[PDB]
Amino acid sequence: GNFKSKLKKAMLSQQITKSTIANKMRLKVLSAREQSLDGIFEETKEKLSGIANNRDEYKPILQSLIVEALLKLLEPKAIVKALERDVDLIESMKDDIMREYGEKAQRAPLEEIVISNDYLNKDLVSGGVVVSNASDKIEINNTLEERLKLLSEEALPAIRLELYGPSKTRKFF
Amino acid sequence: FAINKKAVEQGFNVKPRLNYNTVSGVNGPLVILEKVKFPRYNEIVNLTLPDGTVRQGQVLEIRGDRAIVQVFEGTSGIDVKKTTVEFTGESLRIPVSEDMLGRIFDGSGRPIDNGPKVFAEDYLDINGSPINPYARIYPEEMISTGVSAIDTMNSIARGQKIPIFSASGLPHNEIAAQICRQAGLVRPEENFSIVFAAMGVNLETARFFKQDFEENGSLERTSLFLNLANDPTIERIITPRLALTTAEYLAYQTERHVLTILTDMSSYADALREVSAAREEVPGRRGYPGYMYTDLSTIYERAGRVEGRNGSITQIPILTMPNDDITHPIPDLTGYITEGQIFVDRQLHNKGIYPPINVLPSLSRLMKSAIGEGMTRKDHGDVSNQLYAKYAIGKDAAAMKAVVGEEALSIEDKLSLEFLEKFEKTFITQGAYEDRTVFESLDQAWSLLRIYPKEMLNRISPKILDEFYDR
Amino acid sequence: LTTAEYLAYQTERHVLTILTDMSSYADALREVSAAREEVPGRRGYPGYMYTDLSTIYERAGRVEGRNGSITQIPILTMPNDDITHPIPDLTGYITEGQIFVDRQLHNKGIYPPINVLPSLSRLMKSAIGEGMTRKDHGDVSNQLYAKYAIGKDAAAMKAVVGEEALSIEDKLSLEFLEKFEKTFITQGAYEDRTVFESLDQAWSLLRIYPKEMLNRISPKILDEFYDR
Amino acid sequence: LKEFEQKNAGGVGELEKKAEAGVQGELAEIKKIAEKKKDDVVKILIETVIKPSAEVHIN
Amino acid sequence: EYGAIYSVSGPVVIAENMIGCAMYELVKVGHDNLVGEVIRIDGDKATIQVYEETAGLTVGDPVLRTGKPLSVELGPGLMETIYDGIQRPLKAIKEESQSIYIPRGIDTPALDRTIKWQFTPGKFQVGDHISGGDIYGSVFENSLISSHKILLPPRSRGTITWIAPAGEYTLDEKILEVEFDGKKSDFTLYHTWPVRVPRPVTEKLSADYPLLTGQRVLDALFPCVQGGTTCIPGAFGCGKTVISQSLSKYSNSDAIIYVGCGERGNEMAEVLMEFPELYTEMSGTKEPIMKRTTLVANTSNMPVAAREASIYTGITLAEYFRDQGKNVSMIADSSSRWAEALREISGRLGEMPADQGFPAYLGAKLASFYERAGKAVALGSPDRTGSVS
Amino acid sequence: EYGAIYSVSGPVVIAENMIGCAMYELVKVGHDNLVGEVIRIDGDKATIQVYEETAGLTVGDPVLRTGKPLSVELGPGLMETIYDGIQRPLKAIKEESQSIYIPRGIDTPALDRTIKWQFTPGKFQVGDHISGGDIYGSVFENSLISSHKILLPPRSRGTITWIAPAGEYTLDEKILEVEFDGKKSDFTLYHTWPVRVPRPVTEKLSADYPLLTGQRVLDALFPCVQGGTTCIPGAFGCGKTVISQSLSKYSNSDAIIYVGCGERGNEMAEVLMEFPELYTEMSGTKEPIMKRTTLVANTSNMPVAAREASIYTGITLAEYFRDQGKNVSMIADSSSRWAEALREISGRLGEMPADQGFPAYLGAKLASFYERAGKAVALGSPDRTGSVSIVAAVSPAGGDFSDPVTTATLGITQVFWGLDKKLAQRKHFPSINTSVSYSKYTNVLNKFYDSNYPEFPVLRDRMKEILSNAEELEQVVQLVGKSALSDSDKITLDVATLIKEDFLQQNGYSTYDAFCPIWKTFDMMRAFISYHDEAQKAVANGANWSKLADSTGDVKHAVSSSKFFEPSRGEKEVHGEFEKLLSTMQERFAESTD
């Protein structure tokens, strides 16, 4: 009986080691795939910044984004915030945005467009717009940074599907 | 492989969110916002204080351009003129994959095992949906637990829901951990697995759980959610349905045979009572809202068996008796939704017998479907009945001692006595790590049964007695 | 209370106060608690009268500066022979000691019809013993309480089982009890008993027993006065 | 008993390396195939980001 | 009119621009078109009770008025079917869904319209009058049932103008055209009826005919009349399923109905998949005992409403079948759980319990519900009869 | 801001023109400048707690906000001091007043600035990176607690740009120039911390090293371990304070804190001025034990909010000390009074309870308040290891199942000592019901006993089992009295009687009955075990119990007087006496048995 107790203790130690080791391999695998994901996402962020650095393609997309912000807001008295470098582009596109909001909306075109002296951090912010109504309590953030942030976590399932294709044992779905 | 179409369409569809700064006031644990757009009832909000700290909350109720939210972490010291909040534009949801095994999660379900993020295979709604009674079968094929005192007498079919009733001074959590360590299917793992949750445990209890479930090496079969006492109450109600959702996903999309255990429905009921005090609702009897029957039934019902799939789901919750009786509404109503009951004796603990369990008031309502052969030896059925009758006779004999005289007891009475002591000591007592296959426990029962003449056991088929009395 | 404070702690005179009825006080407080809506406590009582009761009982005791002292004796009426009722329960929470009376003894024509078992003075140790009294007092009281309870429970047991499990000491404690209520508790409306003769009668009643039952008596004291 | 005990006195590290190697091939292959299939995923993600989602919230 | 959701609160919702609506009427609220039901009408505002999960809803969503209180359909196809406490075709629902859940926001008619039926027109010709409860044709349905006897809904007056001749038909074709003041009125192979007010009958009659069970002790010493009331204690461990299983085979009533208030389901699962296995011997052995009964079952998952209206639906169907010229006998699952559901619904609505956590309603509700049983003569030209037990 | 008082309702006030505040924030109100904390806010009307008396107040009075929640002052001078529930110096207020009353609006500082101290720089050189929880110097506060550690309050980082020299110093002096971004990091000898939020810690740990009380039943039977808690009913005849005094004078505690909420005033004044009479019974006779004691005594007559905040203040102080890696203990007057205050406040606020007079959250609040106790390793480079133990003196309402607070406690705690009313009725104090109390730590604590008394557990277990059997057979015998009964029956009866009169009885005031060590308890237990076992094995073969006891004579009495063995008399003289007793008992059994 003493011998069997000692053997039991040794075998318990063996399985304890097995459990620890098995745990850590899987943790490492998860971390590694996470690193791959992180590389992908930082590459996407770099591409976002690079594209935002050029005015040509940026302008129409910026106008569309602001129009979408209007669609979300739905009032004729709002204030627009953006980096100082495109203030004149915004001023030029004011008329088009007003008219197109009037078109999309079932109400009349926008009455006013206002841009204060604030501008977003060129360092921290690289391309994007934020819209707040005239009363200036409700904010609409439509900046590329937070856009990609939300996408990254709200797109994980299909993203993984693409990364590893179909999965197994999920027979009924 | 068509759901992939929706998977891609949604996983490549992004929509921004609004942010508000229209706090009209805070009243107790609740906040009020006035100017809102198309509010969605009972969805989650992220609140940022004017100092950089951010919390989470859910919509309580809505009114024409008006909404009320509750902060999961309380409304301490927050501001009314410099605070903002964003809405997810969607109710709460949980990420899901087939790899939560080996990973632990907090009350909100976020990992706390210091490992990478869950890497959701998919998201899902927190609460499931009813199931067609037409689409269910009844269980069979008892599931082994490694505990002689339970399996031998009170077996459990793959699906039967049986609570366990405890008192304040009763050690039960240890029993749950021991069961998890000994949990498994009976040999003639394969797809069997476990998921565990706990509410309002002591810190030291939490560390105990973690370390034991790890060093046991069974963490692969399991996935633990936890909810400490210090955790905010609202999170309490979240955990059980999260665990249920995970178990449903596994069982009905991976054919896992799943078991789970809720630590104390008592704390859950307490937390529920906390809710609806916010609203001007006077609670029902004993100061308890009426609809707990419906709610607790909602939680319990998810367990069952589906013909179309090989998915076994079984539920074994635990409850504590407040005044050490059965009159509190919780046990009373649970006796209806449930099937059978398990009693743990405080006195037997005062007798030191581990586990301090007794069987006289405890029964399995559906063991009959899970005791036949192909799955356990034929004798297993009626041997238990004969043992129970002998146990009752021994209790009487114990009463018989001084009523008329210790010597006055009959030879039958004396035999019943000695059997009582021998069985209650050896057979019932289980070491903290002692493990018993059903077979060896039944053999112990046979040994303890041969104590009587072959004729005293007048509740058996002759052939079975002949074969098992002469080995 | 204002008058008592003024007199005591400005004239240094020892003053005692008697309050006839707290029940009427609670009644008036409840009375003016409903003409204006108020979330009621147990039995309609606003929960905060605990505060007012503390305010009333705040005034008592002695302080270093002032020689005069104040002592409170509020007479309280049980509504239905009850203690868990909010009034008596709350009073017991914050008050000191308590004096209890029972209808049974009065029906038995016993004056005063005190009920010892519930009535307890939280504070007795400091102002007893040697220096001012005889140290036996503590053991005397403890033994009296114990034997009284024993006799009461013995009578209760016999009331349901009869003379079939009655030890000799059971009936001894009984007869001790009957004599105790008959003589010790009973007093004339004009006789005062100093602690001395009181303890003398106590020892007289006690000496019916052997020197082994009375374990609540120190061997020293158990031997000093067992026989004089 | 001691002969049985000493079996793992040095084999624990050897078998730990055994498992470690057991996950290296597929391990690195994770990143290898990910990079192999990086262009498609990143380009699709950016395309999804850029495209407008104008919508009046049919209520 | 078809206004939007003014406000939401848990299982209680409030609408706006809701007019022309009685305080008892269903609604297909929200995009999910959940089966809500109105309770209190005040100003243009109203209070509507939802019966499914209310999470995720918003302000400004379509709401439509069914125009009538809770009802139930009646016609060919009832026999050999399984339904929810609110008459949900569980079989068809699962079949079309191919899913194990109960997809919230589901929609499936009470009875299939695809299947065609053979109809034999009655003996009433154009110009003849007609009254509620009259018989104007029959439809063969199963071997066990001779034919579904086509009846006229109560509160029906006028004369017939157009008649569908004999032939094959589905439950949608307008087979009858009558006129109380003009050809406006018409009818189909089926109809519906509210669930609250009992289905009226011509006249009653004292019940004195014995009940058939095939059990020595029961039918011999302590029997019940065909048209009587009976009660037995619960605690199934005593094996009360014997009376049910025998009665499913041994009854002088050609039609039997079992209503499931609601339980863990395993019981319902077993009874469900064991009922279509017993035998009866009319003109030779016949297995499908289900042909002699239609089953409604519930369980905790389905809302309280279903677990409240289950018994009403069952007894209404029993009254219908009695009036169809038959002897019916409906068995219950458990009154206690229905009484619970009632207590809890009242508590949710916030009503004061008479005692023991129960509202006063229990007494009158139970008495009225039991009043709906016995033998009687129902409307119809043949003046056939029936009984309810 | 400068608000206006709109409405006053006893201990409640509504101001107007309040904007941008925190619903937990101190406020100065009225002309007398009273103290109050906002509670519920909406628009510009603020519901404010008042911690003082209201009389003669009128609308429009100025209202001054503060901008911070309720905190307490931490540093030196705390120890051997008495404060109210809201951290006000009772002694300083009294002496300054030179009266016997408390003025309204007094602001005597929590920690005096009138005393200097001899500081010593630590080992942190200027220019080094620093963070909270890192000691940078120490000062002497008292002999028993010399070298008061000085720590950087958390949420405080930067680089030490300077160090103050050693020497004699008072508070109010910057002593550490640090820079996170700018010189702004200026710290004096003390600091503050909000009461509601517990301070952080590196991590937690298990429990071991059992606490000691000196009373046999508690330590022996239902073990108590530091870093833990329990509920102790107070009967006033079961030694209401004797247990506390024994804990203070025997428990190996670095610091002692007791609080008073339902203080009747008599007990308050007494305990206060009898602490001076108490002496430190540790490492030599130090006449003052208060050097380990700091008190927060509050009578009912103070505003309810004070009784509410008393426990938070006390536990915060406990955490502050234990952060230095010490052992602390807490004593509570009566938790029932605190719950009564809580329900009073809730009702006054105007929200319905749900527990026959208690708001639902009570359970959550009690759980949170409890969860600050335990054992943990401190935070910061110095690597301290603290330990907080407490005890809640539950005062029942005359019942057990009537008050849910009992359930709440029993649902969270892990050691609980019940109470048998009959024991009190028999004056059988120590009055504890054995069948109800329980202690889960016994399981883990085997790993500790095995080092000292590796046979103690099983012996105690068998003794408890015997007690349970005696309790059980009582219910049978009483209904039938003496009958045909085996010698074992009398054996169980008499052994249980001896155990209870020995164990469950002891004078609260005696050198051999008000205090016991572990080893002495071990000896008592072993002696009783041997007695009973030898008696039973002897009767196993004839040996009628009458003649058996006669042959052994007064062995039961021989062991009965063992209680009179005075402890502290060498631990070998007493141990030698117990060895002699065991020898005589075993030989006497062996011989008289034959």
PDB file of C-alpha atoms in Angstrom, chain A residues 14-162:
ATOM      1  CA  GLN A  14       3.584  13.378 -14.137  1.00  0.00           C
ATOM      2  CA  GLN A  15       0.043  14.391 -15.082  1.00  0.00           C
ATOM      3  CA  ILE A  16       0.487  17.786 -13.419  1.00  0.00           C
ATOM      4  CA  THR A  17       3.482  18.404 -15.659  1.00  0.00           C
ATOM      5  CA  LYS A  18       1.527  17.135 -18.661  1.00  0.00           C
ATOM      6  CA  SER A  19      -1.327  19.522 -17.869  1.00  0.00           C
ATOM      7  CA  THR A  20       0.955  22.521 -17.467  1.00  0.00           C
ATOM      8  CA  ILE A  21       2.840  21.803 -20.699  1.00  0.00           C
ATOM      9  CA  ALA A  22      -0.340  21.221 -22.728  1.00  0.00           C
ATOM     10  CA  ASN A  23      -1.746  24.479 -21.387  1.00  0.00           C
ATOM     11  CA  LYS A  24       1.299  26.473 -22.396  1.00  0.00           C
ATOM     12  CA  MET A  25       1.558  25.155 -25.960  1.00  0.00           C
ATOM     13  CA  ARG A  26      -1.997  26.267 -26.692  1.00  0.00           C
ATOM     14  CA  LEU A  27      -1.404  29.627 -25.037  1.00  0.00           C
ATOM     15  CA  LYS A  28       1.662  30.103 -27.238  1.00  0.00           C
ATOM     16  CA  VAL A  29      -0.237  29.128 -30.391  1.00  0.00           C
ATOM     17  CA  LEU A  30      -2.987  31.611 -29.577  1.00  0.00           C
ATOM     18  CA  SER A  31      -0.429  34.348 -28.959  1.00  0.00           C
ATOM     19  CA  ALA A  32       1.364  33.589 -32.232  1.00  0.00           C
ATOM     20  CA  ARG A  33      -1.775  33.767 -34.337  1.00  0.00           C
ATOM     21  CA  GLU A  34      -2.521  36.980 -32.455  1.00  0.00           C
ATOM     22  CA  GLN A  35       0.851  38.351 -33.563  1.00  0.00           C
ATOM     23  CA  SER A  36       0.024  37.491 -37.170  1.00  0.00           C
ATOM     24  CA  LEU A  37      -3.277  39.343 -36.807  1.00  0.00           C
ATOM     25  CA  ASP A  38      -1.461  42.312 -35.275  1.00  0.00           C
ATOM     26  CA  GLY A  39       0.941  42.494 -38.199  1.00  0.00           C
ATOM     27  CA  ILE A  40      -1.959  42.414 -40.637  1.00  0.00           C
ATOM     28  CA  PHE A  41      -3.771  45.180 -38.776  1.00  0.00           C
ATOM     29  CA  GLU A  42      -0.748  47.459 -38.475  1.00  0.00           C
ATOM     30  CA  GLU A  43      -0.126  47.014 -42.198  1.00  0.00           C
ATOM     31  CA  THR A  44      -3.715  48.102 -42.804  1.00  0.00           C
ATOM     32  CA  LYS A  45      -3.214  51.103 -40.509  1.00  0.00           C
ATOM     33  CA  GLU A  46      -0.091  52.127 -42.411  1.00  0.00           C
ATOM     34  CA  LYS A  47      -2.011  51.879 -45.681  1.00  0.00           C
ATOM     35  CA  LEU A  48      -4.798  54.012 -44.216  1.00  0.00           C
ATOM     36  CA  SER A  49      -2.318  56.701 -43.209  1.00  0.00           C
ATOM     37  CA  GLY A  50      -0.594  56.640 -46.586  1.00  0.00           C
ATOM     38  CA  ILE A  51      -3.853  56.990 -48.489  1.00  0.00           C
ATOM     39  CA  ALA A  52      -5.012  59.759 -46.151  1.00  0.00           C
ATOM     40  CA  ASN A  53      -1.791  61.623 -46.951  1.00  0.00           C
ATOM     41  CA  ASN A  54      -2.896  62.274 -50.570  1.00  0.00           C
ATOM     42  CA  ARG A  55      -5.651  64.785 -51.324  1.00  0.00           C
ATOM     43  CA  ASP A  56      -6.945  63.440 -54.640  1.00  0.00           C
ATOM     44  CA  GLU A  57      -8.634  60.199 -53.606  1.00  0.00           C
ATOM     45  CA  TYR A  58      -9.156  61.578 -50.099  1.00  0.00           C
ATOM     46  CA  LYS A  59     -11.509  64.381 -51.130  1.00  0.00           C
ATOM     47  CA  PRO A  60     -14.440  62.396 -52.615  1.00  0.00           C
ATOM     48  CA  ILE A  61     -14.274  59.804 -49.848  1.00  0.00           C
ATOM     49  CA  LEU A  62     -14.176  62.601 -47.280  1.00  0.00           C
ATOM     50  CA  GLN A  63     -17.260  64.172 -48.838  1.00  0.00           C
ATOM     51  CA  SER A  64     -19.077  60.837 -48.783  1.00  0.00           C
ATOM     52  CA  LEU A  65     -18.131  60.304 -45.135  1.00  0.00           C
ATOM     53  CA  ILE A  66     -19.409  63.742 -44.158  1.00  0.00           C
ATOM     54  CA  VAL A  67     -22.621  63.063 -46.076  1.00  0.00           C
ATOM     55  CA  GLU A  68     -23.055  59.831 -44.124  1.00  0.00           C
ATOM     56  CA  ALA A  69     -22.516  61.786 -40.919  1.00  0.00           C
ATOM     57  CA  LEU A  70     -25.322  64.099 -42.016  1.00  0.00           C
ATOM     58  CA  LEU A  71     -27.533  61.094 -42.719  1.00  0.00           C
ATOM     59  CA  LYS A  72     -26.908  60.033 -39.130  1.00  0.00           C
ATOM     60  CA  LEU A  73     -27.462  63.507 -37.655  1.00  0.00           C
ATOM     61  CA  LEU A  74     -30.584  64.758 -39.504  1.00  0.00           C
ATOM     62  CA  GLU A  75     -30.530  68.403 -38.379  1.00  0.00           C
ATOM     63  CA  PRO A  76     -29.787  71.562 -40.403  1.00  0.00           C
ATOM     64  CA  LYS A  77     -27.543  73.132 -37.716  1.00  0.00           C
ATOM     65  CA  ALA A  78     -24.286  71.249 -37.136  1.00  0.00           C
ATOM     66  CA  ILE A  79     -20.564  71.853 -36.664  1.00  0.00           C
ATOM     67  CA  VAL A  80     -17.744  70.029 -38.458  1.00  0.00           C
ATOM     68  CA  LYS A  81     -14.301  69.192 -37.067  1.00  0.00           C
ATOM     69  CA  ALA A  82     -11.319  68.098 -39.147  1.00  0.00           C
ATOM     70  CA  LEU A  83      -7.592  68.550 -39.600  1.00  0.00           C
ATOM     71  CA  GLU A  84      -6.618  72.064 -40.620  1.00  0.00           C
ATOM     72  CA  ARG A  85      -4.914  70.822 -43.786  1.00  0.00           C
ATOM     73  CA  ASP A  86      -8.215  70.172 -45.617  1.00  0.00           C
ATOM     74  CA  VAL A  87     -10.296  73.099 -44.348  1.00  0.00           C
ATOM     75  CA  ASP A  88     -10.348  74.647 -47.818  1.00  0.00           C
ATOM     76  CA  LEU A  89     -11.370  71.338 -49.383  1.00  0.00           C
ATOM     77  CA  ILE A  90     -14.250  71.257 -46.901  1.00  0.00           C
ATOM     78  CA  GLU A  91     -15.150  74.841 -47.787  1.00  0.00           C
ATOM     79  CA  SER A  92     -15.184  73.976 -51.489  1.00  0.00           C
ATOM     80  CA  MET A  93     -17.332  70.881 -50.928  1.00  0.00           C
ATOM     81  CA  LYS A  94     -19.755  72.710 -48.609  1.00  0.00           C
ATOM     82  CA  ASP A  95     -22.179  73.446 -51.447  1.00  0.00           C
ATOM     83  CA  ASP A  96     -22.134  69.913 -52.834  1.00  0.00           C
ATOM     84  CA  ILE A  97     -22.616  68.395 -49.382  1.00  0.00           C
ATOM     85  CA  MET A  98     -25.536  70.705 -48.598  1.00  0.00           C
ATOM     86  CA  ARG A  99     -27.249  69.961 -51.909  1.00  0.00           C
ATOM     87  CA  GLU A 100     -26.685  66.214 -51.674  1.00  0.00           C
ATOM     88  CA  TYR A 101     -28.020  66.088 -48.122  1.00  0.00           C
ATOM     89  CA  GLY A 102     -31.114  67.885 -49.360  1.00  0.00           C
ATOM     90  CA  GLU A 103     -31.361  65.265 -52.097  1.00  0.00           C
ATOM     91  CA  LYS A 104     -30.895  62.171 -49.926  1.00  0.00           C
ATOM     92  CA  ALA A 105     -32.920  63.651 -47.083  1.00  0.00           C
ATOM     93  CA  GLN A 106     -36.634  64.187 -47.599  1.00  0.00           C
ATOM     94  CA  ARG A 107     -36.219  67.659 -46.091  1.00  0.00           C
ATOM     95  CA  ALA A 108     -34.659  70.741 -47.647  1.00  0.00           C
ATOM     96  CA  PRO A 109     -30.903  71.009 -48.229  1.00  0.00           C
ATOM     97  CA  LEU A 110     -28.719  71.890 -45.287  1.00  0.00           C
ATOM     98  CA  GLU A 111     -28.948  75.481 -44.102  1.00  0.00           C
ATOM     99  CA  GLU A 112     -25.487  76.041 -42.620  1.00  0.00           C
ATOM    100  CA  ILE A 113     -22.035  74.489 -42.403  1.00  0.00           C
ATOM    101  CA  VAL A 114     -19.743  75.638 -39.588  1.00  0.00           C
ATOM    102  CA  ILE A 115     -16.115  74.734 -38.880  1.00  0.00           C
ATOM    103  CA  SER A 116     -14.590  76.091 -35.682  1.00  0.00           C
ATOM    104  CA  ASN A 117     -10.912  76.747 -34.943  1.00  0.00           C
ATOM    105  CA  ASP A 118     -10.362  73.246 -33.544  1.00  0.00           C
ATOM    106  CA  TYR A 119      -8.460  70.706 -35.621  1.00  0.00           C
ATOM    107  CA  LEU A 120      -7.672  67.074 -34.976  1.00  0.00           C
ATOM    108  CA  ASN A 121      -4.224  65.865 -33.951  1.00  0.00           C
ATOM    109  CA  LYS A 122      -2.244  65.451 -37.162  1.00  0.00           C
ATOM    110  CA  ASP A 123      -0.008  63.057 -35.227  1.00  0.00           C
ATOM    111  CA  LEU A 124      -2.699  60.927 -33.576  1.00  0.00           C
ATOM    112  CA  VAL A 125      -5.341  61.531 -36.271  1.00  0.00           C
ATOM    113  CA  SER A 126      -4.540  60.764 -39.923  1.00  0.00           C
ATOM    114  CA  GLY A 127      -7.682  61.297 -41.984  1.00  0.00           C
ATOM    115  CA  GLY A 128     -11.223  61.535 -40.663  1.00  0.00           C
ATOM    116  CA  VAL A 129     -14.155  63.763 -39.701  1.00  0.00           C
ATOM    117  CA  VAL A 130     -16.253  64.297 -36.586  1.00  0.00           C
ATOM    118  CA  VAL A 131     -19.688  65.923 -36.730  1.00  0.00           C
ATOM    119  CA  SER A 132     -21.635  67.501 -33.877  1.00  0.00           C
ATOM    120  CA  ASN A 133     -24.975  69.255 -34.092  1.00  0.00           C
ATOM    121  CA  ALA A 134     -25.196  72.994 -33.500  1.00  0.00           C
ATOM    122  CA  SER A 135     -26.246  72.490 -29.883  1.00  0.00           C
ATOM    123  CA  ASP A 136     -22.966  70.552 -29.781  1.00  0.00           C
ATOM    124  CA  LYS A 137     -23.842  67.704 -27.438  1.00  0.00           C
ATOM    125  CA  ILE A 138     -24.206  64.746 -29.816  1.00  0.00           C
ATOM    126  CA  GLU A 139     -21.025  63.732 -31.618  1.00  0.00           C
ATOM    127  CA  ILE A 140     -20.583  61.652 -34.754  1.00  0.00           C
ATOM    128  CA  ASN A 141     -17.100  60.184 -35.146  1.00  0.00           C
ATOM    129  CA  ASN A 142     -16.348  59.039 -38.696  1.00  0.00           C
ATOM    130  CA  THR A 143     -12.557  59.041 -38.628  1.00  0.00           C
ATOM    131  CA  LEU A 144     -10.624  56.313 -40.407  1.00  0.00           C
ATOM    132  CA  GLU A 145      -8.770  55.361 -37.225  1.00  0.00           C
ATOM    133  CA  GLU A 146     -11.798  54.441 -35.120  1.00  0.00           C
ATOM    134  CA  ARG A 147     -13.457  53.129 -38.284  1.00  0.00           C
ATOM    135  CA  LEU A 148     -10.750  50.495 -38.685  1.00  0.00           C
ATOM    136  CA  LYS A 149     -10.771  49.928 -34.932  1.00  0.00           C
ATOM    137  CA  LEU A 150     -14.454  48.987 -34.955  1.00  0.00           C
ATOM    138  CA  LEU A 151     -14.083  46.956 -38.145  1.00  0.00           C
ATOM    139  CA  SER A 152     -11.228  44.875 -36.739  1.00  0.00           C
ATOM    140  CA  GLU A 153     -13.337  43.484 -33.889  1.00  0.00           C
ATOM    141  CA  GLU A 154     -16.707  43.430 -35.658  1.00  0.00           C
ATOM    142  CA  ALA A 155     -15.278  41.479 -38.627  1.00  0.00           C
ATOM    143  CA  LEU A 156     -13.440  38.704 -36.772  1.00  0.00           C
ATOM    144  CA  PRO A 157     -15.681  35.761 -37.796  1.00  0.00           C
ATOM    145  CA  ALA A 158     -15.544  36.193 -41.573  1.00  0.00           C
ATOM    146  CA  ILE A 159     -11.910  37.252 -41.278  1.00  0.00           C
ATOM    147  CA  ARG A 160     -11.019  33.984 -39.559  1.00  0.00           C
ATOM    148  CA  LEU A 161     -13.131  32.068 -42.059  1.00  0.00           C
ATOM    149  CA  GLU A 162     -10.975  33.544 -44.808  1.00  0.00           C
TER     150      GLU A 162
END
